[PDB]
């Protein structure tokens, strides 16, 4: 009579690593590093905007591509590569800082700044911003002199933020192709635009000169921005070459912005995103994208790290 103590084993062993051994077989193991990607944007539960051709910064100035996003609202914001912030050639100064701000704004609320103008034109338009016909940024006003080569009067418009939240203020400086064109638009002489706040003092000057034609135009409108503290005031003194704002922006709340090239899915629910899709996983690590955002597992170089979920596998003596 004899009784023996033993443990189970398999012929289907899987190798893992320890401090001492490399490739020690255990009975059962599971993966800790996620590699399985969902090539969609799981947007269930979150209000989602697919900006598409509308650049994120475009939602503030308002080119034709962003007309449906002038006062958008979202929990998740999606940027597309084909997106564009401009119609008339140009770019933002501190563009990325502004993007990072709008990606978690929860959208924007626009408010009239209430500027009125006397002895000038405000109907500056272009073929690059087509909307039925020639037009301009929906939130801005392209100011001119009045006839052609005419003198642009010195002005001083101001706006106060009467709200409990900071106001996003944006204006533009126009850079004509030539001093001839700058004169044709705003009259002769050196133009100056100064912007004053209670913690901001920047100054601006047009830089007329020949440049490559973007969409057929060598002119450049470049936008600048500041945040207006509650109850504070901004003041715009200028004599031409100034792209005035019509409305200010107020941040709605909280959101998250991503860049992606894959479709949206409203039935799946995710919280970690990258440009190639959504990572849904309870695994502690992932090897899909280092720049993944949201609430994600830590990124690692390794594609696989097996965690033993069983004892050491010792084959039965045949």
């Amino acid at each position: 009579d004899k009784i023996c103590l033993g443990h189970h084993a398999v012929s289907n062993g899987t190798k893992v690593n320890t401090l001492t051994e490399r490739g020690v077989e255990v009975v059962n193991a599971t993966e800790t590093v996620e590699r399985t990607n969902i090539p969609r944007i799981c947007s269930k539960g979150k209000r989602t905007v697919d900006l598409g051709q509308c650049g994120l910064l475009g939602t503030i100035t308002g080119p034709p591509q962003c007309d449906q996003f002038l006062e958008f609202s979202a929990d998740l914001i999606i940027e597309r590569r084909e997106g564009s912030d401009v119609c008339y050639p140009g770019k933002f100064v501190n563009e990325e800082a502004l993007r990072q701000i709008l990606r978690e704004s929860g959208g924007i609320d626009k408010e009239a700044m209430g500027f009125t103008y006397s002895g000038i034109r405000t109907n500056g338009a272009t073929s690059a911003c087509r909307r039925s016909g020639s037009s301009f940024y929906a939130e801005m006003k392209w100011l001119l002199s009045n006839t052609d080569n005419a003198a642009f009067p010195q002005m001083t418009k101001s706006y106060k933020n009467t709200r409990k939240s900071p106001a996003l203020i944006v204006w533009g400086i126009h850079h004509s192709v030539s001093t001839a064109e700058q004169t044709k638009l705003y009259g002769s002489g050196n133009k100056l635009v100064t912007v004053g706040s209670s913690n901001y003092q920047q100054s601006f000057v047009p830089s007329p000169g020949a440049r490559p034609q973007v969409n057929g135009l060598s002119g450049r409108i470049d936008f600048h921005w500041l945040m207006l503290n509650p109850n504070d005031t901004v003041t715009f003194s200028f004599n031409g070459a100034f792209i005035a704002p019509d409305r200010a922006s107020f941040l709605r709340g909280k959101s998250m912005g991503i860049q992606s090239g894959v479709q949206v899915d409203a039935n799946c629910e995710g919280d970690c995103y990258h440009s190639g899709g959504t990572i849904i996983s309870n695994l502690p690590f992932q090897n899909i994208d280092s720049r993944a955002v949201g609430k994600c597992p830590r990124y690692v170089k390794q594609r696989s790290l097996l965690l033993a979920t069983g004892m050491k596998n010792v084959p039965e003596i045949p």
């Binding site: 023996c4 033993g6 001492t20 309870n282 609430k295 979920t309």
Partner: protein, 169 residues
Amino acid sequence: GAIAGFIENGWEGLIDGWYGFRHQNAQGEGTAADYKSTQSAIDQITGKLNRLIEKTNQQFELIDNEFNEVEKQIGNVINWTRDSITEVWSYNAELLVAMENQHTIDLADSEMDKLYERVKRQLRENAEEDGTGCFEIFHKCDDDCMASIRNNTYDHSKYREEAMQNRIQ
């Protein structure tokens, strides 16, 4: 027709538990799993799993742009910082798993010893170790006797006379 235990041998036939008993008497050979030791091992392993499933509440947002690349200097600082942090987590992951696996394997061996030591202490002076993880029982042990060992109801006082007589003479 000899049977052997864990001292160098797994049992591919034991399929309803991690640890178990294998006996042979006049009634024949038999194999049964031990519940308590098996569950203890499973509880500790799943305990690690739940511990590594604990998600984080730290949310991270974009700091660079893969459509319109940011400025070089701040861009390189970012890439340098990210890669540095990636090195850290890759190290931590590698070490964590390696450390856990060493412990998972060790605690599994520990449970096996505990079970073996329990049975040894049950049999008292009525059995001797054969060195393969088996006990040579020096008395008649039918299926009911063998079952009494598995459920820890083996009274060594009952067989002590018969056993010590066979061990010595």
